[PDB]
């Protein structure tokens, strides 16, 4: 229940996390400015934070940089976006791609996608080819104490796909999930035991809840479909006083024989680290630590076309601090 | 498939060497396609195994089955999950439709001796699906 969102300002209720007496000033710090949104009633703080995050994402999508140079240069479209985003303190639209068809900085009726249930896939999109590029980004976070033991060792998956197809395909994501393997009766091979799986808005919650069916309409462009998060009980890939020798950790940067050492802390920068050779910045591509392998992607379109799905697995170091 | 024919003798020898009863990581071949085995592919593999021999009548073992699945995945990019057998006791039918291989008793289902036997009706009748409709969805 924000009263006025200010960066530029745009009042939403006119009745007006900090607190100026009876008015709460809840805002986050951006790259150069703090988006303080005044509130007076018992508004949802989580809702305000989500609205601020959505606004930041929309600004990043529309403007490649988040600085004061664009605040004073793109006010014509910024004001329109702010007015359209939230009315009376209640946001209604948050899709940057969908919003790009009604508000431009360089106006017809709003697209029916916002009115329709599918607000994350613009209808009528046509391309010469139907290629969707996936990105299974690995995040290795290790919390090793000074005694030598690892306390917090969690790996969070991130399936980011750049869908570029024709029409409104309804992707049916299928992987080697442990729960799915157990339900189908194949709970004996390598299955990913994801403790927490966070699907995107395109993925239907009911389908996943029913029989672990991940069916959703992918959007046009790069977006995060699913975000797995499960604990890891294996030895660390890098031991600082262990990964497979077939994997190479490109751009190894262990922040404190081989590799350039430069003091800016001591940055142990290594270009290529063969397998078997303080925060580490290891990023070994083509290495799936969790062992989760994508099974199938049911690309179904009403028009009917032969899709060419693609995906790559990248293993990087997340909260890998020592 | 010249590669499959070449790998069949070595795979059979390795399975025979392993009795019936060190490196970490999951490397993936760059650009190698990975997908579940299809019914037609499973039928073709079963026919090739029957023609070449070494699989029909061989004593079923976990190590031999794992080695065969790994060899199949290496030579074809098929996930090692379609080579599943129905729960015992008795004859275990293949989990993947189209597979002509099945396990039959040779004498708790775990202690029962099983051997791989060719079954042409498996590729046409979904015995595993009929027995376990819940497992087939």
């Amino acid at each position: 229940s924000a009263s006025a969102v200010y960066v530029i300002c745009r009042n939403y209720r006119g009745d007006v996390i900090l607190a100026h007496g009876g008015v709460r000033f809840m805002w986050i710090k951006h790259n150069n400015l703090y988006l303080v949104a005044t509130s007076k009633k018992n508004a949802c703080v989580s809702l305000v934070f989500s609205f601020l995050y959505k606004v930041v994402q929309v600004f990043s999508e529309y403007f490649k940089e988040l600085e004061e140079e664009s605040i004073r240069d793109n006010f014509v479209i910024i004001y329109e976006l702010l007015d359209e985003l939230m009315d009376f303190g209640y946001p209604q639209t948050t899709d940057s791609k969908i919003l790009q068809e009604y508000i431009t900085q360089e106006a017809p009726r709003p697209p029916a996608t916002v009115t329709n249930a599918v607000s994350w896939r613009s209808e009528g999109i046509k391309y010469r080819k139907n290629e969707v590029f996936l990105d299974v980004i690995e995040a290795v976070n290790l919390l090793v104490s000074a005694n030598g033991n690892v306390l917090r060792s969690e790996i969070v998956g991130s399936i980011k796909m750049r869908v570029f197809l024709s029409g409104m395909p309804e992707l049916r994501l299928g992987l080697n999930d442990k729960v799915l393997f157990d339900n189908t009766g194949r709970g004996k091979s390598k299955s990913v035991e994801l403790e927490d799986v966070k699907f995107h808005q395109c993925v239907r919650l009911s389908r996943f809840e029913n029989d672990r069916t991940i069916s959703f309409i992918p959007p046009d462009g790069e977006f995060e479909l699913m975000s797995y998060r499960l604990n890891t009980h294996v030895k660390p890939l890098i031991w600082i006083e262990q990964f497979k020798r077939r994997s190479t950790a490109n751009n190894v940067e262990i922040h404190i024989t081989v590799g350039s050492v430069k003091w800016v802390e001591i940055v142990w920068s290594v270009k290529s680290f063969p397998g078997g050779k303080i925060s580490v910045k290891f990023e070994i591509p083509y290495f799936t630590t969790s062992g989760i392998q994508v099974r199938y992607l049911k690309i179904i379109e009403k028009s009917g076309y032969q899709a060419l799905p693609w995906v790559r697995y990248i293993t990087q170091n997340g909260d890998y601090q020592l | 498939s010249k590669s499959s024919v070449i790998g069949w003798p070595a795979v059979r020898e390795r399975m025979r060497r392993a009795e019936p009863a060190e490196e970490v990581g999951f490397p993936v071949t760059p650009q190698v396609p990975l997908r579940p085995m299809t019914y037609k592919a499973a039928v073709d593999l079963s026919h090739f195994l029957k023609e070449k021999g070494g699989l029909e009548g061989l004593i079923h073992s976990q190590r031999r089955q794992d080695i065969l699945d790994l060899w199949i995945y290496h030579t074809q990019g098929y996930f090692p999950d379609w080579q599943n057998y129905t729960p015992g006791p008795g004859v275990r039918y293949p989990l993947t439709f189209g597979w002509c291989y099945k396990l039959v008793p040779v004498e708790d289902p775990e202690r029962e001796v099983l051997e791989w036997r060719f079954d042409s009706r498996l590729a046409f009748h979904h015995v595993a699906r009929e027995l376990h409709p819940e497992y087939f969805k």
């Binding site: 083509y286 693609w310 | 997908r35």
Partner: peptide, 18 residues
């Protein structure tokens, strides 16, 4: 080529599960 692992084609569904 591309850093972080070459992109690989994805399947359509579990062909072994019907």
């Amino acid at each position: 080529d591309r850093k972080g692992g070459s992109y690989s084609q994805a399947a359509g569904s579990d062909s072994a599960q019907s």
